[PDB]
Design a protein around this ligand. Structure first.
Ligand SMILES: NC[C@H](Oc1noc2ccc(-c3ccccc3Cl)cc12)c1ccccc1
Ligand SMILES: [Cl-]
Ligand SMILES: [Mn+2]
Ligand SMILES: [Mn+2]
Lengths: 483, 189, 481, 189
DNA sequence: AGCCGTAGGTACCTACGGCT
DNA sequence: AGCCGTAGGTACCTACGGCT
């Protein structure tokens, strides 16, 4: 037992590492669109009551809390993950609301974690909604001292909405973000027809929708990626040609491809010009400002053909760039290449499970409460005898037993009565009990209706999705040109 | 590690010396990139009233400012080579931002005195309180501190130059006892 | 606008200088702490990071402190916290560390991510009674929290752990001392306001370094305690011993305070290499956790080992001085203080702490007695109580009727309305009565204490003596005549 | 970065390669400095099965191990010049410690194969309950992992060298598909 | 000289896969 | 190429006073 064969060691050690990176680091879960680190951050913000109504917390406190309770890795891993969730040029639907320098398109990092502050965005409440109603399974944290969610309720389709990118071991994932109104329309369409095809779903979901806008060239790359989960999609900057006077022209770029560093793209153009690999450029300036948005200007030599220069720039610089779609996510605790319809089907299955479990928990909680009110009413109807029983009893134990035998109360009912405070004996309280009881019986019935009919439950899912669509859905930003 | 502006006209250009790499980032987003340059400093910079000339001229921070200003130093100083007509000191509104500000003024006074005399040296006025530059948003740094329409600058005026020499020597020089006596006399603990 | 450069320099410098003196670099004479240390310990308290509870991740502790109390870099905070855990830096360590917390070789601690910390047992004594109105709270930097202005400091921590700080226009350098000796000194002063420095030194013989070693002579100690300034000569503990074949070696088992061991060895090695010292054939650090500090210097056969050793004292940190400069905050203002002054301010603090604790305890006992008198009334007239509540439509009406019908206060009425039914069992009834009876005796005891200055001062003595008996230990540094 | 031992007798000397600068400091206090040397590694080290010799030999970590071992590499390897007759791999008991261990063994396999064949290469076994090396006390590291009286080292034995080549090439080489197929096949495990 | 201890600090090796 | 994003990362500038 003190000797180890090198082949065995390599095989065991490697496979421990590889499997861990696939299931527990680099790939998102198809159900909520999250990687372990992101899930721990959001759950931490939840568990710290860092909601949108409450004010910002110091990043270092947020991060320290997360690394200690849920994420036993370096803080920079955590803080960088949290930063990207706050950037409107990385996240189509930002999950974190930042206070401070949270970075720019130039690949300027955020301010250090001691400078910055953060909370949930409003949409993030939708990812966490119902987490405390037995909707999702909790698990032990890394050290056994805490509980952490294995998946979030994810009341909107966050995998496709914000997209994912991860290098794992043995594969990677690259899923572009999408428009929320489109996604939800597609889930609705699918819910009404299990046999919907990719072509029909694409009547709702036309293509990715980058936070950074821009153009996509043609539907062919989109189509292949949604049918097979793999595809190349050509993203192009929004550029125009315009006059600058004395009969000279310039190209003006105001939107650039997703995940392209603006500063570095400019450098590449500058280098092309310097090394004479492009003809006709006289000047290159970044006129971007917080006031006017992205504005890059490329001056053209008098009488040069600006359209030819621009075509060259797309060919020779990140001004046009591809997004290689490779939709690998979490399907039952494993990395799986999935097409568009599969991603939506796993999402809708998760929603059905969430809403069913929510309904069941609410039903249990309502019946337990009814049960307590049935005892409280008995107690108030016999209050003198109740008090006298308690006064004659030496101990809690004795009082519990007497109350249970004399008035047919359960253990829980007896406990509730012994816990009653004296102010609950005022005159309106008897009627308050009766009020609450009558609504609760009504509520119980409504819940039971839902658990009885698959169709009623499914409509409830549709209704909640539609409400989310109306509150948060927005306009498409990326233009897909039939080029 | 300077972020220069577009315009080459020193007369309409401003360079902001900002405490801290973190505040640095914010000010580059917020600024007008046409007329406003940003030079971030790590933190405490050399005290030139206490260092040797060899050490001063070898110091990275100092070298970067000299290059950025373009005027040369000491004997070789030429006001007409100045690359900016506004050098704006922008530090945290706290006791360490204060210190950094004294360190910078000492440097200008001892090595580029005419820049003060010419009225090219300013102090920015970020919002007062507990929050430092590193914690502020880019747009808010613009609104309060960098925007010509709303910002409040202080121009640095030299008045009595004998009084200035004695002051710089007392506060920043190597004689601790004269510094300690100044503190005790003016302390208001 | 326009600002005169002289005015700006004067105002800006004085802003900085004042801050560094009263709010960064110098300890408070009352609890021995600088802002950063105070905030760390207070944080550990506020997180219930006590000795009975298991350790917390350093980064959580530090992130908490930086956010609530200390708006500075976390390296400032973490490094300060690290030192408080090192038994070669703190005569009485304030932090109990889990993980690599550094060594005498100037190895840093492990990163904040890896390490964990709580209070030591003695730190409980610095914090004890902080929540009984003993010390003044103040608003934190941003107005969102409360922080202590000073800690209760139930032992004399300034002199016990000492301090060193570079400020502006002044620095401070106070060596650590032995706790048993200090507390005996405070006791002697409490019995005699007019005690001299010489008499105090019958209790307090001199500094007592965590790292032991020797001090040469009483005369630097004497000057420092009388004036607050003084130079004190420290030496390593070294012996000459045979290694056989008629050869010898020097063995060092204790080195002076704040000397980096690895660095001191390199200095010796360099002296040997550059031929500036004669007779050394070998130099090894045989230090271990198991055998403790052990540095061996082999001597060339027939060379005089005593001469070599005397040379090493002349040319290496093997002998080192501690320049005493006892500057602390007294009343918020910086001040050079002698030993008697340090102890006088500490004893004043203790009297104030114990008096305020006694007054708080008294108010809290009387409030609680008052509530129990209402519960007793309610139990004595329970049927009427229930009748009055049932006749009332609302809480407000019940409150009013209970107050008018049983001559109860608002607080008493609220408490009765809050009482649960399970409080009417026999065992619960007896508890209320027994708590009242204990509380009346407690109140009486408290009143005795606030009535007699001598009794209160004796209480301070008694508590100090308890701490002396629990935490006092042996002198480590030998003062040679 | 090497903390070497006293004895120059390679037969009784051991060098521990410890994951992390933090864990490295701990093991220097805890060790027996007569017979035990310590060499800390920043983190993930170069995968030599994927990198070219120029990059390998320019790598600081690799250079330090080569110098420390004293045996030279590849063709020029001399077992007799080994400075330690125990090279012990000491990583965290977690998935990243596992990976570091694979990176190390790949390096020894491809550049110092005879060191394995001679039985000089071992794997330390720190306490497996969730904690990394950076969180242990010096005495703890000593008792469990470094003390010859109580420690359980595994000697790394090379058995079938054809099978070892294929293993190193499949897990650590450039061809992803072979790696992916291995993970899929053994994932149940 | 250069250390000491709280402050304003910092830049950059590595694995991993896909790009086609 | 080298970059995308989570992982195992880290050196070394300065101020300040008093001692050597
Ligand atoms: N779906 C076919 C194939 O699955 C796997 N490829 O590599 C794997 C590595 C591991 C596991 C696994 C098995 C069980 C437990 C934990 C793990 Cl992570 C499954 C796969 C695939 C092909 C292409 C892309 C993605 C996936
Ligand atoms: Cl002798
Ligand atoms: Mn600041
Ligand atoms: Mn680890």
């Amino acid at each position: 037992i003190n000797e180890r064969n090198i082949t065995s060691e390599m095989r065991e050690s490697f496979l421990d590492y590889a499997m861990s990176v696939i299931v527990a680091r680099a790939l998102p879960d198809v159900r909520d669109g999250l990687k372990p680190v992101h899930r721990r951050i959001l759950y931490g913000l939840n568990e710290q009551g860092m909601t949108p109504d409450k004010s910002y917390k110091k990043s270092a406190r947020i991060v320290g809390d997360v690394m200690g309770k849920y994420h036993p890795h370096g803080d920079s891993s955590i803080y960088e993950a949290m930063v990207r969730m706050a950037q409107d040029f990385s996240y189509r639907y930002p999950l974190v609301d930042g206070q401070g320098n949270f970075g720019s398109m130039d690949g300027d990092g955020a301010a250090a974690m001691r400078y910055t502050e953060a909370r949930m965005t409003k949409i993030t409440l939708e990812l966490l909604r119902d987490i405390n109603k037995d909707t999702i399974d909790f698990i032990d944290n890394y050290d056994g001292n805490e509980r952490e969610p294995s998946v979030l309720p994810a009341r909107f389709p966050n995998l496709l909405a914000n997209g994912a990118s991860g290098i794992a071991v043995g594969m990677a994932t690259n899923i572009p973000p999408h428009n929320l109104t489109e996604l939800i329309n597609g889930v609705l369409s699918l819910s009404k027809n299990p046999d919907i095809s990719i072509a029909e779903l694409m009547e709702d979901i036309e293509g990715p929708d980058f936070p950074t806008a821009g153009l996509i060239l043609g539907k062919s790359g989109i189509r292949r990626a949604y049918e097979t989960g793999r595809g190349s999609i050509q993203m192009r900057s929004r550029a125009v040609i315009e006059e600058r006077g004395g009969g000279r022209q310039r190209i003006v770029v105001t939107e650039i491809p997703f995940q392209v560093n603006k500063a570095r793209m400019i450098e590449k153009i500058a280098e092309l010009v310097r090394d004479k690999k492009i003809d006709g450029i006289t000047d290159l300036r970044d006129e971007t400002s917080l006031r006017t948005g992205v504005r890059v200007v490329i001056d053209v030599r008098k009488d040069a053909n600006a359209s030819v220069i621009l075509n060259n720039l797309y060919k020779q610089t990140p001004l046009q760039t591809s997004f290689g779609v490779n939709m690998i996510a979490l399907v039952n605790g494993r990395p799986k290449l999935i097409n568009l319809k599969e991603a939506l089907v796993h999402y809708l299955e998760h929603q059905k499970t969430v809403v069913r479990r929510r309904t069941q928990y609410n039903l249990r909680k309502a019946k337990d409460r009814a049960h307590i009110l049935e005892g409280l009413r008995i107690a108030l109807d016999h209050i003198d005898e109740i008090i006298s029983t308690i006064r004659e009893s030496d101990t809690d134990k004795v009082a519990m037993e007497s109350l249970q035998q004399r008035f047919k109360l359960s253990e829980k009912q007896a406990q509730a009565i012994l816990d009653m405070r004296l102010r609950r004996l005022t005159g309106l309280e008897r009627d308050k009990i009766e009020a609450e009881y009558n609504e609760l019986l009504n509520y119980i019935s409504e819940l039971e209706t839902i658990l009885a009919d698959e169709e009623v439950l499914l409509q409830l899912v549709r209704d909640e999705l539609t409400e989310i669509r109306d509150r948060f859905g927005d306009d498409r930003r990326t233009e897909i040109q039939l080029g | 590690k300077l972020a220069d502006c577009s315009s080459k006209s020193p007369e309409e250009c401003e360079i902001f010396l900002v405490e801290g790499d973190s505040a640095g980032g914010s000010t580059k987003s917020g600024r007008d990139s046409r007329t406003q340059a940003i030079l971030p400093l790590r933190g405490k910079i050399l005290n030139v009233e206490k260092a040797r000339l060899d050490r001063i001229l070898n110091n990275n921070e100092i070298r970067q400012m000299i290059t950025a200003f373009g005027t040369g130093i000491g004997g070789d100083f030429d006001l007409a080579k100045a690359r900016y007509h506004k050098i704006v000191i922008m530090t945290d509104a706290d006791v360490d931002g204060a210190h950094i500000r004294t360190l910078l003024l000492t440097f200008f006074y001892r090595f580029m005195r005419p820049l003060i005399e010419a009225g090219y040296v300013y102090i920015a006025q970020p919002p007062t309180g507990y929050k430092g530059l590193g914690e502020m948003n880019a747009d808010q740094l613009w609104e309060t501190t960098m925007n010509p329409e709303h910002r409040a600058l202080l121009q640095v005026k030299l008045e009595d130059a004998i009084e200035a020499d004695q002051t710089f020597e007392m506060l920043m020089g190597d004689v601790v006892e004269n510094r300690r006596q100044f503190i005790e006399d003016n302390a208001v603990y």
